[PDB]
Amino acid sequence: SKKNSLALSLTADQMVSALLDAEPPILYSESMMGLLTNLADRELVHMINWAKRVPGFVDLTLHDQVHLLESAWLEILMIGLVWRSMEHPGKLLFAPNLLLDRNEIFDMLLATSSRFRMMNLQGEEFVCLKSIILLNSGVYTFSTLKSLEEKDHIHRVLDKITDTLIHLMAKAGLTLQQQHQRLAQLLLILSHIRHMSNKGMEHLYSMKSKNVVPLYDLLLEMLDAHR
Amino acid sequence: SKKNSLALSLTADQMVSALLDAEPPILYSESMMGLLTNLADRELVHMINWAKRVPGFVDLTLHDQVHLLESAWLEILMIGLVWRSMEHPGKLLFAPNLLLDRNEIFDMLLATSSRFRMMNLQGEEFVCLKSIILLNSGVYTFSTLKSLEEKDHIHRVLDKITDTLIHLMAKAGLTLQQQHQRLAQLLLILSHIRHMSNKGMEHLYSMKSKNVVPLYDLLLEMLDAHR
Ligand SMILES: C[C@]12CC[C@@H]3c4ccc(O)cc4CC[C@H]3[C@@H]1CC[C@@]2(O)C#Cc1cc(CN(CC(=O)O)CC(=O)O)nc(CN(CC(=O)O)CC(=O)O)c1
Ligand SMILES: C[C@]12CC[C@@H]3c4ccc(O)cc4CC[C@H]3[C@@H]1CC[C@@]2(O)C#Cc1cc(CN(CC(=O)O)CC(=O)O)nc(CN(CC(=O)O)CC(=O)O)c1
Ligand SMILES: [Eu+2]
Ligand SMILES: [Eu+2]
């Protein structure tokens, strides 16, 4: 209701449950780039559905919902990957039947996955991060009274997810200090994910340009939204 | 000493003073792109000097020092600008004698400046942010025992700057909660600055490619480091 919003009245545990229930279905893959863009294409359908279930999200205009999707899709895909590969050091689990390794975007992705493991990132935190990406990546790329009213909403939901995260950390045995150091640690990693997304976008765009065959519709649509 | 490091033994106020003393000299400008790349070129000299004085920085290898500079230079330039223009709504103060306005990278830069104003960002916080950019932007783009020892250092200094920031906020009248919400707010903005840096880099590169005249040496060197 963007004023009576259900998202602002959710406790930290409620928020966490909602996010966990919203988690998309495990997908499997069906050349190497072709397997990746196929998976990517199919995950995007499920991510559009996932976003609906993210507290605060349906309270924005449809155009703003689409803008956030267009802005954050790769980062979201990437944080998923980085997360799946957390336990496979030197490897990238794109799907259970698609695991690759060591021996550069892929290297940045491996490092990030390592960083997560060394921090021992938790599934409850993961889902928090993924939503922040959704709500934040587009936000300074939307002017008007409605525009700032939308921005103010997103900022309010983001503050709400911060509280959750902080709550989670406190629930586990962590000093106030340790809480704000881990919060900082995790958010700074999203800088790197933005960066990787910008590089992956450039890469994907190259392949499009040098391939003759246009690749999947949805995936192409989310790529074209950038530029 | 990266073990006896002076940076890890600095209190929050000490850290803040050091950062403030390290602040570079006000520069003035001397076509529009030519004025901007000139200023940019001249600021870079002073930023190399500024970095030396950033606690923790001289404790890294020289190659890692250069890598961090090459990685973070535009973001740092941009956070400077965004900060200078905070008080000139709809305008960008590149230098006191170079002020531009409204009527897109520049728009992202204005929005960020607005965001800062609405948050009423403080000079003590500004300098904290600028250093985090320095220490963080390159860090997941450095493998070996020394490599992780460097990473562990940077992470330790970053944790130290988090404490400072949090301290500052507490010093001003802020709830624990307000502290972790503002910390989140500020770090998420660095995602956007990374993003803008990636876009500005692409832009700068275009101008280089379509201009015949090569522009300034230092500036060209920091651009070439990307790619
Ligand atoms: C967008 C993206 C494709 C889709 C990716 C994706 C999909 C789903 C998902 O859930 C998460 C993510 C996360 C990352 C997403 C990719 C990042 C950029 C992309 O376009 C690519 C790649 C790609 C792939 C391969 C696979 N490669 C495997 C192999 O050679 O068999 C096939 C390819 O060379 O054709 N190589 C490179 C470049 N390669 C550089 C090179 O080898 O010199 C990176 C490297 O392998 O380390 C880039
Ligand atoms: C790298 C950079 C030049 C240096 C910049 C800088 C320098 C020092 C510093 O302390 C901070 C920063 C922060 C930003 C830095 C710029 C971002 C990208 C850059 O290459 C540019 C520009 C630029 C400039 C101008 C100036 N422009 C002013 C004017 O037209 O007279 C001259 C130009 O058109 O030649 N226009 C555009 C694109 N323009 C798109 C266009 O107008 O359709 C943006 C727009 O004006 O909103 C891009
Ligand atoms: Eu490859
Ligand atoms: Eu222009």
Coordinates of C-alpha atoms and ligand atoms in Angstrom, one line a residue:
Chain A
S1 CA 0.0 0.0 0.0
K2 CA 3.2 2.2 0.1
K3 CA 1.9 3.8 3.3
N4 CA 0.1 0.8 4.7
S5 CA 2.9 -1.4 3.3
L6 CA 3.1 -4.9 4.7
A7 CA 6.8 -4.8 4.3
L8 CA 7.3 -2.1 6.9
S9 CA 5.4 -4.1 9.5
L10 CA 7.3 -7.3 9.2
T11 CA 9.6 -8.3 12.0
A12 CA 13.1 -9.6 11.2
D13 CA 12.0 -13.2 11.4
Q14 CA 8.9 -12.7 9.3
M15 CA 11.1 -10.9 6.6
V16 CA 13.5 -13.8 6.6
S17 CA 10.8 -16.4 6.2
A18 CA 9.2 -14.5 3.4
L19 CA 12.5 -14.2 1.6
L20 CA 13.2 -17.9 2.1
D21 CA 9.8 -19.0 0.8
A22 CA 10.3 -16.7 -2.2
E23 CA 13.4 -18.6 -3.2
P24 CA 13.2 -19.8 -6.9
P25 CA 13.3 -23.4 -8.1
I26 CA 16.6 -25.3 -8.7
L27 CA 17.3 -25.2 -12.4
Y28 CA 19.5 -27.6 -14.5
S29 CA 21.2 -26.9 -17.8
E30 CA 19.7 -28.3 -21.0
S31 CA 28.6 -24.8 -26.8
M32 CA 29.5 -23.6 -23.3
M33 CA 28.1 -20.1 -23.9
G34 CA 24.9 -21.6 -25.1
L35 CA 24.4 -23.6 -21.9
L36 CA 25.1 -20.5 -19.9
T37 CA 22.8 -18.1 -21.7
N38 CA 20.1 -20.7 -21.8
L39 CA 20.3 -21.2 -18.0
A40 CA 20.5 -17.5 -17.7
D41 CA 17.4 -17.0 -19.9
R42 CA 15.4 -19.6 -17.9
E43 CA 16.4 -18.2 -14.5
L44 CA 15.1 -14.8 -15.5
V45 CA 11.5 -16.0 -15.8
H46 CA 11.8 -17.4 -12.2
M47 CA 13.5 -14.1 -11.0
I48 CA 10.6 -12.0 -12.3
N49 CA 8.3 -14.2 -10.1
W50 CA 10.8 -14.1 -7.2
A51 CA 10.8 -10.3 -7.2
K52 CA 7.0 -10.1 -6.8
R53 CA 7.4 -11.9 -3.5
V54 CA 10.1 -9.5 -2.2
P55 CA 8.5 -7.3 0.6
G56 CA 8.1 -3.8 -0.7
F57 CA 8.4 -4.6 -4.3
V58 CA 4.8 -4.8 -5.4
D59 CA 4.3 -1.4 -3.8
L60 CA 6.2 0.4 -6.6
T61 CA 4.8 1.4 -10.0
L62 CA 5.0 -1.3 -12.6
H63 CA 7.5 0.8 -14.6
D64 CA 9.7 1.1 -11.5
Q65 CA 9.4 -2.7 -10.9
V66 CA 10.6 -3.3 -14.4
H67 CA 13.4 -0.8 -14.1
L68 CA 14.7 -2.5 -11.0
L69 CA 14.6 -5.8 -12.7
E70 CA 16.4 -4.5 -15.8
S71 CA 19.0 -2.8 -13.6
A72 CA 19.8 -5.7 -11.2
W73 CA 19.3 -8.9 -13.2
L74 CA 23.0 -9.9 -13.8
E75 CA 24.1 -8.9 -10.3
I76 CA 21.3 -11.1 -8.9
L77 CA 22.2 -14.0 -11.2
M78 CA 25.9 -13.6 -10.1
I79 CA 25.2 -13.4 -6.4
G80 CA 23.2 -16.7 -6.9
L81 CA 26.2 -18.3 -8.6
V82 CA 28.8 -17.1 -6.2
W83 CA 26.6 -18.4 -3.4
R84 CA 26.1 -21.9 -5.0
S85 CA 29.8 -22.2 -5.6
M86 CA 30.7 -21.2 -2.0
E87 CA 31.4 -24.8 -1.0
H88 CA 33.3 -25.7 -4.2
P89 CA 36.6 -23.9 -3.8
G90 CA 38.1 -23.2 -7.2
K91 CA 34.8 -24.1 -8.9
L92 CA 31.6 -22.4 -10.2
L93 CA 28.3 -24.3 -9.8
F94 CA 26.1 -22.7 -12.4
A95 CA 23.6 -25.6 -11.9
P96 CA 24.0 -28.9 -10.1
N97 CA 24.8 -30.5 -13.5
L98 CA 27.1 -27.7 -14.5
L99 CA 30.2 -27.3 -12.4
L100 CA 33.4 -25.6 -13.7
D101 CA 36.8 -24.9 -12.2
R102 CA 40.3 -23.3 -12.0
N103 CA 43.5 -23.2 -14.3
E104 CA 38.8 -12.1 -15.8
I105 CA 35.1 -12.2 -14.8
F106 CA 35.1 -15.8 -13.8
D107 CA 38.1 -15.2 -11.5
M108 CA 36.3 -12.2 -9.9
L109 CA 33.4 -14.6 -9.4
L110 CA 35.5 -17.2 -7.7
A111 CA 37.2 -14.7 -5.4
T112 CA 33.8 -13.4 -4.3
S113 CA 32.7 -16.9 -3.6
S114 CA 35.8 -17.5 -1.6
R115 CA 35.2 -14.3 0.3
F116 CA 31.8 -15.5 1.2
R117 CA 33.1 -18.9 2.4
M118 CA 35.8 -17.3 4.5
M119 CA 33.1 -15.2 6.1
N120 CA 30.9 -18.2 6.4
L121 CA 27.9 -16.4 4.8
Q122 CA 24.5 -17.7 6.0
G123 CA 21.5 -18.5 3.8
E124 CA 19.4 -16.0 5.8
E125 CA 21.9 -13.3 5.1
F126 CA 22.2 -14.4 1.5
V127 CA 18.6 -13.7 0.8
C128 CA 18.8 -10.3 2.5
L129 CA 21.7 -9.3 0.2
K130 CA 19.9 -10.5 -2.9
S131 CA 16.9 -8.2 -2.1
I132 CA 19.1 -5.2 -1.4
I133 CA 20.6 -5.7 -4.8
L134 CA 17.1 -5.8 -6.3
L135 CA 16.0 -2.6 -4.5
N136 CA 19.2 -0.7 -4.7
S137 CA 20.8 -1.3 -8.1
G138 CA 18.2 0.7 -10.0
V139 CA 17.3 3.4 -7.5
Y140 CA 19.6 6.3 -8.5
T141 CA 18.6 5.6 -12.2
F142 CA 14.9 6.3 -12.1
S143 CA 12.5 14.3 -10.8
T144 CA 8.9 14.4 -9.5
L145 CA 6.9 14.1 -6.3
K146 CA 6.0 10.5 -7.0
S147 CA 9.6 9.7 -8.0
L148 CA 10.9 10.8 -4.5
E149 CA 8.0 9.1 -2.9
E150 CA 9.1 5.8 -4.5
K151 CA 12.7 6.5 -3.6
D152 CA 11.6 7.1 0.0
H153 CA 9.8 3.8 0.0
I154 CA 12.8 1.8 -1.3
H155 CA 15.0 3.6 1.2
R156 CA 12.6 2.6 4.0
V157 CA 12.5 -1.0 2.9
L158 CA 16.3 -1.1 2.6
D159 CA 16.5 0.3 6.2
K160 CA 14.2 -2.5 7.1
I161 CA 16.5 -5.2 5.6
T162 CA 19.4 -3.6 7.3
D163 CA 17.6 -4.1 10.7
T164 CA 17.0 -7.7 9.8
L165 CA 20.6 -8.4 8.9
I166 CA 21.8 -6.7 12.0
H167 CA 19.2 -8.8 13.9
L168 CA 20.5 -12.0 12.4
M169 CA 24.0 -11.2 13.4
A170 CA 23.0 -10.4 17.0
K171 CA 21.0 -13.7 17.1
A172 CA 24.2 -15.5 16.3
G173 CA 26.8 -14.6 18.9
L174 CA 28.2 -11.2 17.7
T175 CA 29.4 -8.0 19.4
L176 CA 27.7 -4.8 18.4
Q177 CA 31.1 -4.0 16.9
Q178 CA 31.3 -7.3 15.1
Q179 CA 27.8 -6.6 13.8
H180 CA 28.7 -3.3 12.2
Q181 CA 32.0 -4.7 10.8
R182 CA 30.3 -7.6 9.1
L183 CA 27.5 -5.4 7.8
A184 CA 30.2 -3.2 6.2
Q185 CA 32.1 -6.2 4.9
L186 CA 29.0 -7.6 3.2
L187 CA 27.8 -4.3 1.6
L188 CA 31.3 -3.5 0.2
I189 CA 31.1 -6.8 -1.6
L190 CA 28.0 -5.6 -3.5
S191 CA 30.3 -2.9 -5.0
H192 CA 32.3 -5.7 -6.5
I193 CA 29.2 -7.5 -7.7
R194 CA 28.0 -4.3 -9.4
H195 CA 31.4 -4.1 -11.0
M196 CA 31.3 -7.7 -12.2
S197 CA 27.8 -7.1 -13.5
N198 CA 29.1 -4.1 -15.6
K199 CA 31.9 -6.3 -16.9
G200 CA 29.7 -9.3 -17.6
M201 CA 27.2 -7.0 -19.4
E202 CA 30.0 -5.8 -21.7
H203 CA 31.1 -9.4 -22.3
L204 CA 27.6 -10.6 -23.1
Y205 CA 27.1 -7.7 -25.4
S206 CA 30.3 -8.6 -27.3
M207 CA 29.1 -12.2 -27.8
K208 CA 25.8 -10.8 -29.1
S209 CA 27.7 -8.5 -31.5
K210 CA 30.1 -11.2 -32.8
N211 CA 27.6 -14.1 -32.9
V212 CA 25.3 -14.2 -35.9
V213 CA 22.5 -16.0 -34.1
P214 CA 20.5 -13.8 -31.7
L215 CA 20.1 -15.5 -28.4
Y216 CA 17.1 -15.9 -26.2
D217 CA 14.4 -13.3 -26.1
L218 CA 14.1 -12.5 -22.4
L219 CA 17.8 -12.4 -21.8
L220 CA 18.3 -10.2 -24.9
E221 CA 15.6 -7.9 -23.5
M222 CA 17.3 -7.5 -20.2
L223 CA 20.6 -6.9 -21.9
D224 CA 19.2 -4.2 -24.2
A225 CA 17.8 -2.3 -21.2
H226 CA 21.3 -1.4 -20.4
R227 CA 22.2 1.3 -23.0
Chain B
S1 CA 54.7 -2.4 9.4
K2 CA 51.7 -4.5 8.4
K3 CA 51.9 -6.2 11.8
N4 CA 53.0 -3.3 13.8
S5 CA 50.9 -1.0 11.6
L6 CA 50.3 2.5 12.9
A7 CA 46.8 2.4 11.3
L8 CA 45.5 -0.3 13.5
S9 CA 46.5 1.6 16.7
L10 CA 44.7 4.8 15.7
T11 CA 41.6 5.8 17.7
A12 CA 38.6 7.1 15.7
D13 CA 39.6 10.7 16.3
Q14 CA 43.2 10.2 15.3
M15 CA 42.1 8.4 12.1
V16 CA 39.7 11.3 11.3
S17 CA 42.4 14.0 11.9
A18 CA 44.9 12.1 9.8
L19 CA 42.4 11.9 7.0
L20 CA 41.5 15.6 7.3
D21 CA 45.2 16.6 7.2
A22 CA 45.7 14.4 4.2
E23 CA 43.1 16.4 2.2
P24 CA 44.5 17.6 -1.2
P25 CA 44.9 21.2 -2.3
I26 CA 42.0 23.1 -3.9
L27 CA 42.5 23.1 -7.6
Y28 CA 41.1 25.5 -10.3
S29 CA 40.7 24.8 -14.0
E30 CA 43.2 26.3 -16.5
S31 CA 36.7 23.0 -25.1
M32 CA 34.7 21.7 -22.1
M33 CA 36.2 18.2 -22.2
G34 CA 39.6 19.7 -22.3
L35 CA 39.0 21.6 -19.0
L36 CA 37.7 18.5 -17.4
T37 CA 40.5 16.1 -18.4
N38 CA 43.1 18.8 -17.5
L39 CA 41.6 19.2 -14.0
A40 CA 41.3 15.4 -13.8
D41 CA 45.0 15.0 -14.9
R42 CA 46.2 17.6 -12.3
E43 CA 44.1 16.1 -9.5
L44 CA 45.7 12.7 -10.0
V45 CA 49.1 13.9 -9.1
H46 CA 47.7 15.2 -5.8
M47 CA 45.7 12.0 -5.3
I48 CA 48.9 9.9 -5.5
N49 CA 50.3 12.0 -2.7
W50 CA 47.0 11.8 -0.8
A51 CA 47.0 8.1 -0.8
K52 CA 50.4 7.9 0.9
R53 CA 48.9 9.6 3.9
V54 CA 46.0 7.2 4.1
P55 CA 46.5 5.0 7.2
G56 CA 47.4 1.4 6.2
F57 CA 48.2 2.3 2.6
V58 CA 52.1 2.5 2.8
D59 CA 52.0 -0.9 4.5
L60 CA 51.1 -2.7 1.2
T61 CA 53.5 -3.6 -1.6
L62 CA 54.2 -0.8 -4.1
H63 CA 52.6 -2.9 -6.8
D64 CA 49.4 -3.2 -4.7
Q65 CA 49.5 0.5 -3.9
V66 CA 49.6 1.2 -7.7
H67 CA 46.8 -1.3 -8.4
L68 CA 44.5 0.3 -5.8
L69 CA 45.2 3.7 -7.4
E70 CA 44.6 2.4 -10.9
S71 CA 41.4 0.7 -9.7
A72 CA 39.8 3.6 -7.7
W73 CA 40.9 6.8 -9.3
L74 CA 37.7 7.8 -11.1
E75 CA 35.5 6.8 -8.2
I76 CA 37.6 9.0 -6.0
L77 CA 37.5 11.9 -8.4
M78 CA 33.7 11.4 -8.5
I79 CA 33.1 11.2 -4.8
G80 CA 35.1 14.5 -4.6
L81 CA 32.9 16.2 -7.2
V82 CA 29.6 14.9 -5.8
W83 CA 30.8 16.2 -2.4
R84 CA 31.8 19.7 -3.7
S85 CA 28.5 20.0 -5.5
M86 CA 26.5 18.9 -2.4
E87 CA 25.5 22.5 -1.7
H88 CA 24.7 23.5 -5.3
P89 CA 21.5 21.7 -6.1
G90 CA 21.2 21.0 -9.8
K91 CA 24.9 22.0 -10.2
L92 CA 28.3 20.3 -10.4
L93 CA 31.3 22.2 -8.9
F94 CA 34.3 20.7 -10.7
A95 CA 36.4 23.5 -9.3
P96 CA 35.5 26.8 -7.7
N97 CA 35.8 28.4 -11.1
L98 CA 34.0 25.6 -12.9
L99 CA 30.4 25.2 -12.0
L100 CA 27.8 23.5 -14.3
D101 CA 24.0 22.8 -14.0
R102 CA 20.7 21.2 -15.1
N103 CA 18.5 21.2 -18.2
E104 CA 23.5 10.1 -18.3
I105 CA 26.6 10.1 -16.1
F106 CA 26.2 13.8 -15.1
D107 CA 22.7 13.1 -13.9
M108 CA 23.8 10.1 -11.8
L109 CA 26.4 12.4 -10.4
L110 CA 23.8 15.1 -9.5
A111 CA 21.5 12.5 -7.9
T112 CA 24.3 11.2 -5.7
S113 CA 25.1 14.7 -4.6
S114 CA 21.5 15.2 -3.8
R115 CA 21.4 12.0 -1.8
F116 CA 24.4 13.2 0.2
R117 CA 22.7 16.6 0.9
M118 CA 19.4 15.0 2.0
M119 CA 21.5 12.8 4.3
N120 CA 23.4 15.9 5.3
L121 CA 26.8 14.0 4.9
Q122 CA 29.6 15.3 7.1
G123 CA 33.2 16.1 6.1
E124 CA 34.5 13.6 8.7
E125 CA 32.3 10.9 7.0
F126 CA 33.3 12.0 3.6
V127 CA 37.0 11.4 4.2
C128 CA 36.1 8.0 5.6
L129 CA 34.2 7.0 2.5
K130 CA 36.9 8.2 0.2
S131 CA 39.5 6.0 1.9
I132 CA 37.2 2.9 1.8
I133 CA 36.9 3.5 -1.9
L134 CA 40.7 3.5 -2.1
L135 CA 41.2 0.4 -0.1
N136 CA 38.3 -1.6 -1.4
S137 CA 37.9 -0.9 -5.1
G138 CA 40.9 -2.8 -6.1
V139 CA 41.0 -5.5 -3.4
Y140 CA 39.2 -8.4 -5.3
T141 CA 41.3 -7.7 -8.4
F142 CA 44.8 -8.4 -7.1
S143 CA 46.6 -16.5 -5.2
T144 CA 49.5 -16.6 -2.7
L145 CA 50.4 -16.4 1.0
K146 CA 51.4 -12.7 0.6
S147 CA 48.4 -11.9 -1.4
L148 CA 46.0 -13.1 1.4
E149 CA 48.2 -11.3 3.9
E150 CA 47.7 -8.1 2.0
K151 CA 44.0 -8.8 1.7
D152 CA 43.8 -9.5 5.4
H153 CA 45.5 -6.2 6.1
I154 CA 43.2 -4.1 3.9
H155 CA 40.2 -5.9 5.5
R156 CA 41.6 -5.0 8.9
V157 CA 42.0 -1.3 8.0
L158 CA 38.5 -1.3 6.4
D159 CA 37.1 -2.7 9.7
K160 CA 39.0 0.1 11.4
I161 CA 37.4 2.8 9.2
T162 CA 34.0 1.2 9.9
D163 CA 34.5 1.6 13.6
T164 CA 35.4 5.3 13.1
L165 CA 32.3 5.9 11.0
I166 CA 30.1 4.2 13.6
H167 CA 32.0 6.3 16.3
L168 CA 31.3 9.5 14.4
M169 CA 27.6 8.7 14.2
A170 CA 27.3 7.8 17.9
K171 CA 29.2 11.1 18.7
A172 CA 26.4 13.0 16.9
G173 CA 23.1 12.0 18.5
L174 CA 22.2 8.7 16.9
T175 CA 20.6 5.4 18.0
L176 CA 22.5 2.2 17.6
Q177 CA 19.8 1.5 15.0
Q178 CA 20.2 4.8 13.2
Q179 CA 23.9 4.1 13.2
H180 CA 23.6 0.8 11.3
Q181 CA 21.0 2.3 9.0
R182 CA 23.1 5.2 8.0
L183 CA 26.2 3.0 7.6
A184 CA 24.2 0.8 5.2
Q185 CA 22.9 3.9 3.4
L186 CA 26.4 5.2 2.8
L187 CA 28.0 2.0 1.7
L188 CA 25.2 1.2 -0.8
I189 CA 26.0 4.6 -2.4
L190 CA 29.5 3.3 -3.2
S191 CA 27.9 0.7 -5.4
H192 CA 26.5 3.5 -7.4
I193 CA 29.8 5.3 -7.5
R194 CA 31.5 2.1 -8.8
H195 CA 28.8 2.0 -11.4
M196 CA 29.3 5.6 -12.4
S197 CA 33.0 5.0 -12.5
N198 CA 32.5 2.1 -14.9
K199 CA 30.3 4.3 -17.1
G200 CA 32.7 7.3 -17.0
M201 CA 35.6 5.0 -17.9
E202 CA 33.7 3.9 -21.0
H203 CA 32.9 7.4 -21.8
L204 CA 36.5 8.7 -21.4
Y205 CA 37.7 5.8 -23.5
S206 CA 35.3 6.8 -26.3
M207 CA 36.6 10.3 -26.4
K208 CA 40.1 9.0 -26.5
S209 CA 39.2 6.7 -29.4
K210 CA 37.3 9.4 -31.4
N211 CA 39.7 12.3 -30.6
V212 CA 42.9 12.4 -32.7
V213 CA 44.9 14.3 -30.0
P214 CA 46.0 12.0 -27.1
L215 CA 45.3 13.6 -23.8
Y216 CA 47.4 14.0 -20.7
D217 CA 49.9 11.3 -19.8
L218 CA 49.0 10.5 -16.2
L219 CA 45.2 10.5 -16.9
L220 CA 45.8 8.3 -20.0
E221 CA 47.9 5.9 -17.8
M222 CA 45.1 5.5 -15.3
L223 CA 42.6 4.9 -18.0
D224 CA 44.8 2.3 -19.7
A225 CA 45.1 0.3 -16.4
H226 CA 41.5 -0.6 -16.9
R227 CA 41.5 -3.2 -19.7
Ligands
LIG1 C1 26.6 -13.1 -18.7 C2 27.6 -14.2 -18.8 C3 26.9 -15.5 -19.3 C4 25.9 -15.9 -18.2 C5 26.5 -16.0 -16.8 C6 25.7 -16.6 -15.8 C7 24.7 -17.5 -16.2 C8 23.8 -18.1 -15.3 C9 24.0 -17.8 -13.9 O1 23.2 -18.4 -13.0 C10 25.0 -16.9 -13.5 C11 25.9 -16.3 -14.4 C12 27.0 -15.4 -13.9 C13 27.8 -14.9 -15.0 C14 27.2 -14.7 -16.4 C15 28.2 -14.4 -17.4 C16 29.2 -13.3 -17.2 C17 29.4 -12.7 -18.6 C18 28.8 -13.7 -19.5 O2 28.4 -13.1 -20.7 C19 29.8 -14.7 -19.8 C20 30.7 -15.6 -19.8 C21 31.7 -16.7 -20.1 C22 31.8 -18.0 -20.2 C23 32.8 -18.9 -20.5 C24 32.6 -20.4 -20.6 N1 33.7 -20.9 -21.3 C25 34.1 -22.1 -20.6 C26 35.1 -22.8 -21.5 O3 36.0 -22.0 -22.2 O4 34.8 -24.0 -21.9 C27 33.4 -21.0 -22.7 C28 33.8 -19.9 -23.7 O5 35.2 -19.5 -23.7 O6 33.3 -19.8 -24.8 N2 33.9 -18.2 -20.8 C29 33.9 -16.8 -20.7 C30 35.2 -16.1 -20.9 N3 36.3 -17.0 -20.6 C31 37.5 -16.4 -21.2 C32 38.4 -17.3 -21.9 O7 38.4 -18.8 -21.6 O8 39.5 -16.9 -22.4 C33 36.4 -17.1 -19.2 C34 37.1 -18.4 -18.6 O9 36.8 -19.7 -19.0 O10 37.7 -18.3 -17.5 C35 32.8 -15.9 -20.3
LIG2 C1 35.9 11.1 -16.9 C2 35.0 12.2 -17.3 C3 35.8 13.5 -17.5 C4 36.4 13.9 -16.2 C5 35.3 14.0 -15.1 C6 35.8 14.5 -13.8 C7 36.9 15.4 -13.8 C8 37.3 16.0 -12.7 C9 36.7 15.7 -11.4 O1 37.2 16.3 -10.3 C10 35.6 14.8 -11.4 C11 35.1 14.2 -12.6 C12 34.0 13.3 -12.5 C13 33.5 12.8 -13.8 C14 34.6 12.7 -14.9 C15 34.0 12.4 -16.2 C16 33.0 11.3 -16.3 C17 33.2 10.7 -17.7 C18 34.1 11.7 -18.4 O2 34.9 11.1 -19.4 C19 33.2 12.7 -18.9 C20 32.4 13.6 -19.3 C21 31.6 14.8 -19.9 C22 31.5 16.1 -20.0 C23 30.7 17.0 -20.6 C24 30.9 18.5 -20.6 N1 30.0 18.9 -21.6 C25 29.4 20.2 -21.1 C26 28.8 20.9 -22.2 O3 28.2 20.1 -23.2 O4 29.2 22.0 -22.5 C27 30.9 19.1 -22.8 C28 30.8 18.0 -23.9 O5 29.5 17.6 -24.4 O6 31.7 18.0 -24.8 N2 29.7 16.3 -21.2 C29 29.6 14.8 -21.1 C30 28.5 14.2 -21.9 N3 27.4 15.1 -21.9 C31 26.5 14.5 -22.9 C32 25.8 15.4 -23.8 O7 25.8 16.8 -23.5 O8 24.9 15.0 -24.6 C33 26.8 15.2 -20.6 C34 26.0 16.4 -20.3 O9 26.4 17.7 -20.5 O10 25.1 16.3 -19.3 C35 30.6 14.0 -20.5
EU3 EU 36.0 -19.6 -21.4
EU4 EU 27.9 17.7 -22.5

